[PDB]
Structures are given as C-alpha cells and as structure tokens.
Amino acid sequence: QKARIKLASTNIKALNEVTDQIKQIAERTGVRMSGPIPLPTKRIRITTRKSPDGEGSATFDRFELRVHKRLVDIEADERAMRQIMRIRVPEDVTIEIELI
Amino acid sequence: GNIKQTFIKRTARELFDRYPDKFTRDFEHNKKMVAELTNVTSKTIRNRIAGYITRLVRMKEEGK
Amino acid sequence: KADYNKRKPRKFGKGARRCMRCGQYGPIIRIHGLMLCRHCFREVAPKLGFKKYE
Amino acid sequence: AIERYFIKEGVKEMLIDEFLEKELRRAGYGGLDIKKTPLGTKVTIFAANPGYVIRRIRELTRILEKQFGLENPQIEVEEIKNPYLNAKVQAVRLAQALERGIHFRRAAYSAIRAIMRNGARGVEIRLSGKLTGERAKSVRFYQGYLAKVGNPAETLVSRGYAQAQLKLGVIGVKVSIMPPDAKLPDEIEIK
Amino acid sequence: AKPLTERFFIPKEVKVMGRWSVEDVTVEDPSLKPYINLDARILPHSHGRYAKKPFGKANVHIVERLINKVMRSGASHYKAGGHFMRREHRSIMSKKMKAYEVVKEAFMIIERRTKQNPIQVLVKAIENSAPRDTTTIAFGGIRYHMSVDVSPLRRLDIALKNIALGASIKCYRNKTTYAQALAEEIIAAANKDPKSFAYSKKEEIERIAQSSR
RNA sequence: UCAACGCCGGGAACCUCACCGGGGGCGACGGCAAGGCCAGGCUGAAGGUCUUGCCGGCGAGAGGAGGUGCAUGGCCGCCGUCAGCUCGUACCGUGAGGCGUCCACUUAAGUGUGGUAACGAGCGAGACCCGCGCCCCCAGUUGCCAGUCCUCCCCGCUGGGGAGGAGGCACUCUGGGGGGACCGCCGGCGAUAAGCCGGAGGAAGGAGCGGGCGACGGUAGGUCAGUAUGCCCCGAAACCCCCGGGCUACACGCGCGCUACAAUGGGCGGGACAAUGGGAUCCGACCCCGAAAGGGGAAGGGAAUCCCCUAAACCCGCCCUCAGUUCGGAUCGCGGGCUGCAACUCGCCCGCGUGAAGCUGGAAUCCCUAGUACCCGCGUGUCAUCAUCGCGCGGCGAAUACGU
Ligand SMILES: [Zn+2]
C-alpha cells in the first residue's frame, strides 16, 4: 500500500526541487510520506596520466563524477499518483517508482 | 603569515571612518555589525575585519 | 579475393577494442562501459561531467 | 545498469557534437541539445546563420540515426543572440578570415574592438604558428580584465580554440572572453 | 611457561606496570632532576602526543622513553661495536608490545639480582652515563675544534641511546637475549664498571673534550 | 646528468606490430564483361591459382605506426608553488635607457607600515574550490538495536548469558542546511605602526591540517609511433588481410626493486582484530565431490538489501639453542589442473623429491620533521589467463631540531 520513489542526480538543485514538490503535494493533500532519506553518494574516479609521451616526470589527473541519491515512501493514494506522475522531471534527474 | 591584506585593511578603515561609534571593543558585536553593514559571503574575511576593527578601536580610544 | 580484406571478429585481446574517436588500439579506458583512449578522455571529460574535486 | 547507458548517452552526444562542429563550420556552430521525447529524439541545434543549415537538414536527420543509431529524430534550428560573446564562433570567424587571406594583426585588432564594443569586461586572443617566415612564433592581443587562475577562471570565463589551415600549415587561434555580468569575491560594494 | 597469575595480572594501585613504585626513588643531579619524569602511572604509553612541542619530552615517563629507544633496529649508516646492525624484517619497528615486555623482564631480573628498585638502578645508571663535548667554531674565517658544555636534555638522550645500543650490541648474533643484555648494561653502568658501553663512551667523550679546551 | 633506464599507462602466446620468412587482395574521378562455384592438382591450407565445365551480362585520388618535433598546432616536463612581470601621465638623460619596481622594519609571498621625482593602474601571490577533525536543526531505509513487550535455548550456585519478531530512531552511521578561530584575552619583545614568542581556555592556535587551480616569459627540452596538419616519399608498393617466427636471444657494465644472510628468530597447533573500492553471461553465499590446485549444482544481487571479505603483522603453548643449522631458498626430475582457436619456442597454480650463493657489507651515496618515517597486509588499473609494477586503503607506530 506504499509506493517507493528513488531519485538520482548529479545536481542537487533538481533534487531539492522535486522533493519540496512532493512534500507540498502530500501536505496539501491528506497522505503520508516518509523522508526524504539521503543515501550514500556514489563517486566515480578515473585517474590517468597527463603526458601524451613517456618523457618527463609523471603527473596524474584525478577526475571525479558524483551522484546523489534520495529515497521516499508516499503511501500510494489515488490522487497521490495522479498528482505526482505529472511533475516537471528535468533531464539531469532519474526517477524510479515501485510498489510494496 | 598573519598579515591582513589590502582590501581587508582598507574596508576596515573605511567602515570605521564611517559609522564610528557603531563599533566597540568586543569581537562578537563587531562581527555582527560587519555582517549587517557589508556584502560579504565568507566568514574568514568578516572575522579578520572585525578583529582589525577591535584593534583600531582599542588604540584610538585609549592611545595613539 | 574479397575475403582477404576484412578482419576476424576477435572476442578477447588488445585487437578487440578500439577508440571510437581516435582509432587507437592499446591504452583504452575500460571503466564503466567507456571506450576511449586516455588522450581523448582527458580531452572530453568535462563535456561528460567530470571535474577536479581534489 | 546505471552508467553503462548514462555514459553511452554522454559519449554519443559528444561525438555528434563533434560531427556537427565539423560539418556546420560555414554557418557558425554554437552548441547542441538532445532530449528523447516518447515520440522520438528532439535535437536542438544552435547557430548564427540558420539559413546555411537549411535538404542539408534532411540528410542530417537521416544520417544521424543511420550511422550512430538514434530513433525517430527531428531537428530544430535556433539562432544565437549576442554571438559576439561566444569564443567558439569568434575563433572560427577569425580562422576563416586568416584563410581568406587577411593579415593577422589587422584581423585580431578588428575582432578585439568588435567584441569589446558589444559588451565585455575583458578579452584575450593568442595566435601561434608560422606568422612571419618559417620559424614559428606566438603573439597575444589583450584588453580589459581576466582571471587567468583560480576557480572563477573556470566558472565565469568563456574559452575557445580553432585551427586555421593555410598553404604553409596550421595556425592555432585561442580566444578567451569575460562577460559583464560577473563579479569577484573581493569585489565588494559597501552599504 | 608464564604462570597464570602473571599472564592475567590485575593492578590495584597506581604503579609502573602495577608492580614498582616511585616515591622511594630519589634523583641527586640538580641538572637532571627537572627532566626525569617520575609521575605515578600504570602504563607508559603516550601515543606520540608530546613530540611537536619543543620541550615536550620532559612530560614523558623515563620508562616510556627507554621503551621507545629499545624499539629500534640497531645501527644503520654507522657502526656500533665495530659493525653495522641491519635487521630490516626481523626488527621490532613500530612494535611497542615487545619492547614493553623486554623492559619488564629486564626490570624483573634487576630486582632479582640487586634486591633494590630497578627504577633507582636506572636513575643512577643515567646519572653515571650522562656526559658533561667538543665541536667546531669559527672565530672569523678560521675554524677551531673547541670544547663546549652540554645540556641536560641532550645528556639524557645520549645516555638512553647508549644503554639501548649496549644491549643491542651484547645481544647480536649470540645466545644471550635482549632483556638479559639490558639488565647487564644497566647494572654495570650503575656500579661504574668499564664493562659498559655507556660508561665507556662517557669517559671517552670527556677524555677527548679535555684535550681541545 | 638533475629533467633517460617497473617511462611511452610498454604485465607483447595469436591480434597489438611498426621487424623476419612466405602467400593473397588493391586503380575513387577520367577517356584506348568483371566476377561465383561440385570434384581433382600446385599449395602450410586455400575457385589463391591449372583440368572440368555450369552459372552470371596508361596518370591520379584514397590510404601510410614511411622521413623531418630544426616547418607547425595541441598537450606535457624544467627554471618554479619562484615572486616576480608590465602600462598611463609626468620627470631625468643628445641617446641607448632610467625612475616608479628604491631605503628602514616586516611576511610563506612586489605580503604590509613609514620616507622619497613620482603619482596612479594591471597580471600573478592571496582571494577561490575539495576533503579531515568539534557542536546545532532536519530526515529514519536497504542503515542502527540501547530502553520497552512476547516466544525459544543453555549454565553452577535462578543469578546470569544468548537467538528470534514485534515494535522504536534513543546511540552509531548516512547527507543537506547552519555555527565555530579572529593574535580574539593576558604576558612579555618590537617605531607607540605594521608584527614575533609564549600561558591559559578550548575539538581545533597561530595562512588549524592535507590537496586542486601553477602569472609574463624562456628553454630550437619531449611527442608527426594518440588523433590533426605543410613539404618529401612509396600504387599492385612502405597500402589492406591471413599463416608461422621475433620483441622472451646472453661471455658482461648499470639503475630501480623482491627475498635473505637468523633468536629484536624458524615450525606446528590454538586465540584475535580493518578500510578503501568493485560486481550480468559479472560477484557468486549454501550443499555435495576432491589430499591440494580445482570440479558439479545453485539462493540472491543491477547494489546502505546479495557477494568479493573471520587480512597480516600481534597474543598463548610446545619443539629447535647460535649451527651453513629445523636459517636460506635459487636451480632440476616425475606427476596432477585452469584459461584459451592454439600453451614447444613462450603462460599461471598444486604435491613429492633436489637443496646453489649468502655469517651485516670499502670508496661513495638516498629518503625522511608526526598519526610523519620505519614494519604489515588488502583493493583497484591492465585483464580470456598472468602483479616482485602504478594509483590508493587501513593496521601498529617512534627519534631528534624548533636552527644555519
Ligand atoms: Zn583516442
């Protein structure tokens, strides 16, 4: 009877946006939500050598891509889904919803 | 080095030339006054300015 | 005649992976489905979203 | 899983951007944007002379997903506003000038004034190569303000690079512009 | 084997390792009194907290300093007893447990053989192994080998290093153990026997210094 | 030479490949059928080519891991994490040029306080960005289990100890937003200025700690063998494909390392204790085979849910007691396996045997100021298989100086 929402993004602006949206929805309406819950940030590190040749002292570039993760549970009302599915979902955010 | 730099010292002297008695000999009051009066977004610069102003006030008030 | 012109479909080895930008063979970043040489990755990383963060 | 096709998308976007930067050079290329609607791929192409893009557009629409494999692509063509603040198009403009046969001091000073007129706090152009004879040299023309080092360097400044191909060889053009809507940390304004 | 009342030892009073007191110990050199820490403790382990501060070593218990000296490999880049002592994989480097136990056994042996407090023994040994030296000074262009006095803290460092090196010497590639060697060194230096590396080098250093006065 | 030599991410079985031996393809554009194949033969093997027939109706451009890094672009190292490098107006000089940018004190710093033919500006330093450590607010799943309730099991002495599943977000942790440190207080030393050393208090004390971004310039420094490019050169070829060899060859001189020359130890059996990261024909718990390496099934997991994962050094007891040994472990024989189209040249693991130099090292020389150095193991990159390497992670944890 509860629906679970997973949010993933490289930017926190869109995340704050979507989460405040869902909070306003579930507060103006009568329906319960647990969260939002911050999951551990997932970072991808790629370390490579600068030089295109083999001469000179060796120096290394450390490149890092960060991914933030949020979780919510929304209680799965009918108006809930109808008013949640139609929200501005920018392109820098990935959303996945499932049932329990 | 604990050497306060150009704009720090200049802004202190200017905010002091103006609004003179709105500052006193306590770092906390001076800090919040600086925050009120200036458009600064970092705490380190604010605190250094406030400390320099405390020193200015001490020396002016009770000496040269 | 027309057969001795195309390469076999290797499954493993240095000769089974190219760089889609430069065409090199050897030193290819293999990490997370990416197929780019170190040079090309170091050139186009920010346009993919990587940063300093050091 | 996650990054397999996340990075797939990033890589293909970069490669298509490159193909287009190379095939839309006469028009003035400024960028790209992709959004896969449920109907198909929305493909926004910026430019400064949209007329050049337009049966060319048909050949693009087809070749794109004939070779790289998009699905249901349809292309839009916008026009950049204030193109004299984008270092990319300015670099390509100057390279095309030098290829036409104008002298480099003239071209550089012209571009500098034409950029600084329409609004800018600072500009820097660097030319490198065989400018005077068969031994190579480098020369810079600058004006105004810049932030060569630090984070604001990446955050605020626009940078561009291009290659001029003459009968003798390659000349490298580097451009860097600062916009007027900027401000630095120590640049305070006192109440 | 160790008996159980020694393998599982529980202290009740504040005492070095729970066994040996300090109130009956008395220093006599007025130069070294203020640098010989005799505070009542149970565990001499400071976890490297007093290194940054210049004179922070006067707050460390003598036993902890000795343990840290004993925690060594021997003699690299210099010869001691005639020869390099390089172990490099069978050394107790960054292993304070073993040095703790070595010092404990040595103290037990000392108590057994002397019927006194090993801390008093060690104190007298330091007093007798601390040298009161020469260096090179330029009075303008020209340089002379001169004789200069020494400070208490460097005296202590010297004495402790020399005791530990004497033990490492007498335990080198021989049937003797490190604890027995350390006990021998300490007793010898405390009763002023030339059998001791430390007393020997003290006398040699003062001898040379006397020349170049 | 520093700034070459575990460097070209260069751990090469085929490929990589650029080298050697031998084969087979290859004429965009332009004007004077091509090709597909049953059987047999040449051939390492091949409609590659010959017998057999049947079907089918000349110069350039491309390309080049070919030459030139002394024709270039872009990128990288070094001077150097150095504090330096320029401009306007005025003034001094016939002029090249000078001043400013100098003197005194002062900082990690052309960083600042005063004086002065200079007055004012600019780039760099700083400011800026990331992480560590302390406190507050918000949040409670896939993370946590203290206090609460119910079951179940065990011990000795009913007093203790464990396992579930309810139910909770107290604690830990996770991650967003805020606070906190400023020579601020007090002592001294300093021109009464800029500032220096110390004491408390405090999570933290003197740009708190550690990193990223490295100015104007120059080095004919390196890279055309990463891609791009001017000139020069190679068309049945230096172009494009397949087979086999080689880069793994060894009288020797060098750099960087691994293992040791033993008791500050070797072996056997018992007892403990992490973090970083990664994971679809991938990680693989759990069961069964096997002495070992390994084999057969297979839950779950797209990763706060499952897995890689009960690390070693350390502690306890027993044997060895200063010996070329129960140190050391190279070299060689027989056998058993994995990956892979293929393991001889030229892979990795397991068992039983074999048992070489080496007894602390001259002249000379390297790295290191604190959670640093020494010691110990692990992850990841490369990767079908292969780590004495690079990039990182935690465990145990000092000695000396606060100088010239
Ligand atoms: Zn590439």
CSV table of N, CA and C (backbone and C1' of nucleotides) in Angstrom, one decimal, chain F residues 206-226:
chain,number,residue,atom,x,y,z
F,206,G,P,49.9,26.6,15.9
F,206,G,O5',50.4,27.7,14.9
F,206,G,C5',49.7,27.9,13.6
F,206,G,C4',49.2,29.3,13.5
F,206,G,C3',50.2,30.4,13.3
F,206,G,O3',49.7,31.4,12.5
F,206,G,C1',49.0,30.9,15.3
F,207,A,P,50.5,31.7,11.1
F,207,A,O5',49.3,31.9,10.0
F,207,A,C5',48.4,30.8,9.7
F,207,A,C4',47.5,31.2,8.6
F,207,A,C3',46.8,30.0,8.0
F,207,A,O3',45.6,29.7,8.7
F,207,A,C1',47.7,31.3,6.2
F,208,G,P,44.8,28.3,8.5
F,208,G,O5',44.6,27.8,10.0
F,208,G,C5',45.6,27.8,11.0
F,208,G,C4',45.7,26.5,11.7
F,208,G,C3',46.1,25.3,10.9
F,208,G,O3',47.5,25.1,10.8
F,208,G,C1',44.1,24.7,12.0
F,209,C,P,48.2,24.8,9.4
F,209,C,O5',47.8,23.3,9.1
F,209,C,C5',48.2,22.3,9.9
F,209,C,C4',47.7,20.9,9.5
F,209,C,C3',47.9,20.6,8.0
F,209,C,O3',49.3,20.2,7.7
F,209,C,C1',45.7,20.1,8.6
F,210,G,P,50.0,20.7,6.4
F,210,G,O5',49.3,19.8,5.2
F,210,G,C5',49.3,18.4,5.4
F,210,G,C4',48.4,17.7,4.4
F,210,G,C3',48.5,18.2,2.9
F,210,G,O3',49.6,17.8,2.2
F,210,G,C1',46.2,17.9,3.6
F,211,G,P,50.0,18.4,0.8
F,211,G,O5',48.9,17.8,-0.1
F,211,G,C5',48.7,18.4,-1.4
F,211,G,C4',47.3,18.0,-2.0
F,211,G,C3',46.9,18.7,-3.2
F,211,G,O3',47.4,18.1,-4.4
F,211,G,C1',45.1,18.8,-1.6
F,212,G,P,47.9,19.0,-5.6
F,212,G,O5',46.6,19.6,-6.3
F,212,G,C5',45.7,18.8,-7.1
F,212,G,C4',44.5,19.5,-7.6
F,212,G,C3',44.8,20.7,-8.5
F,212,G,O3',45.1,20.3,-9.8
F,212,G,C1',43.2,21.3,-6.9
F,213,C,P,46.2,21.0,-10.7
F,213,C,O5',45.6,22.5,-11.0
F,213,C,C5',44.5,22.6,-11.8
F,213,C,C4',43.9,24.0,-11.6
F,213,C,C3',44.8,25.2,-12.0
F,213,C,O3',44.9,25.4,-13.4
F,213,C,C1',43.7,25.6,-9.9
F,214,G,P,46.3,25.1,-14.2
F,214,G,O5',47.4,25.8,-13.3
F,214,G,C5',47.7,27.2,-13.5
F,214,G,C4',48.8,27.7,-12.6
F,214,G,C3',50.1,28.0,-13.2
F,214,G,O3',50.1,29.3,-13.8
F,214,G,C1',50.6,26.6,-11.4
F,215,A,P,51.2,29.7,-15.0
F,215,A,O5',51.0,31.2,-15.2
F,215,A,C5',49.7,31.8,-15.1
F,215,A,C4',49.9,33.3,-15.0
F,215,A,C3',50.8,34.0,-16.1
F,215,A,O3',50.1,34.2,-17.3
F,215,A,C1',51.4,34.8,-13.9
F,216,C,P,50.8,33.8,-18.7
F,216,C,O5',51.8,35.0,-19.0
F,216,C,C5',51.3,36.3,-19.0
F,216,C,C4',52.5,37.3,-19.2
F,216,C,C3',53.5,36.8,-20.1
F,216,C,O3',53.2,37.3,-21.4
F,216,C,C1',54.5,37.4,-18.1
F,217,G,P,53.7,36.5,-22.7
F,217,G,O5',55.3,36.6,-22.7
F,217,G,C5',56.1,35.5,-22.8
F,217,G,C4',57.4,35.7,-22.2
F,217,G,C3',58.5,34.7,-22.5
F,217,G,O3',59.2,35.1,-23.7
F,217,G,C1',58.3,34.9,-20.2
F,218,G,P,59.1,34.2,-25.0
F,218,G,O5',60.2,33.0,-24.7
F,218,G,C5',61.6,33.3,-24.9
F,218,G,C4',62.4,32.5,-23.9
F,218,G,C3',62.7,31.1,-24.2
F,218,G,O3',63.9,31.0,-25.0
F,218,G,C1',62.0,31.2,-21.9
F,219,U,P,63.9,30.1,-26.4
F,219,U,O5',64.4,28.7,-25.9
F,219,U,C5',65.7,28.6,-25.4
F,219,U,C4',65.8,27.7,-24.1
F,219,U,C3',65.9,26.2,-24.4
F,219,U,O3',67.2,25.7,-24.5
F,219,U,C1',64.2,26.8,-22.7
F,220,A,P,67.9,25.7,-26.0
F,220,A,O5',66.7,26.1,-27.0
F,220,A,C5',66.9,25.9,-28.4
F,220,A,C4',65.7,25.4,-29.1
F,220,A,C3',65.7,23.9,-29.3
F,220,A,O3',64.4,23.3,-29.1
F,220,A,C1',65.3,25.1,-31.3
F,221,G,P,64.2,21.8,-28.6
F,221,G,O5',64.6,21.9,-27.0
F,221,G,C5',65.7,21.1,-26.5
F,221,G,C4',65.3,20.3,-25.4
F,221,G,C3',64.4,19.2,-25.7
F,221,G,O3',65.0,18.0,-26.2
F,221,G,C1',63.6,20.4,-23.8
F,222,G,P,64.5,17.3,-27.6
F,222,G,O5',63.2,16.5,-27.2
F,222,G,C5',63.3,15.4,-26.4
F,222,G,C4',61.9,14.8,-26.1
F,222,G,C3',61.0,14.5,-27.2
F,222,G,O3',61.3,13.3,-27.9
F,222,G,C1',59.8,15.6,-25.4
F,223,U,P,60.9,13.1,-29.4
F,223,U,O5',59.3,13.0,-29.4
F,223,U,C5',58.6,11.9,-28.9
F,223,U,C4',57.2,12.1,-28.8
F,223,U,C3',56.5,12.4,-30.2
F,223,U,O3',56.2,11.2,-30.9
F,223,U,C1',55.7,13.9,-28.5
F,224,C,P,56.8,11.0,-32.4
F,224,C,O5',55.5,11.2,-33.4
F,224,C,C5',55.1,12.4,-33.7
F,224,C,C4',54.1,12.4,-34.9
F,224,C,C3',54.5,11.4,-36.0
F,224,C,O3',53.4,10.7,-36.5
F,224,C,C1',54.3,13.7,-36.8
F,225,A,P,53.5,9.2,-36.9
F,225,A,O5',53.6,8.5,-35.5
F,225,A,C5',52.5,7.9,-34.9
F,225,A,C4',52.7,7.3,-33.5
F,225,A,C3',53.7,8.0,-32.6
F,225,A,O3',53.4,7.9,-31.3
F,225,A,C1',54.5,5.8,-33.0
F,226,G,P,52.5,9.0,-30.5
F,226,G,O5',51.0,8.8,-31.1
F,226,G,C5',50.3,7.5,-30.8
F,226,G,C4',48.9,7.7,-30.8
F,226,G,C3',48.3,8.7,-31.9
F,226,G,O3',48.1,8.0,-33.2
F,226,G,C1',47.4,9.2,-29.8
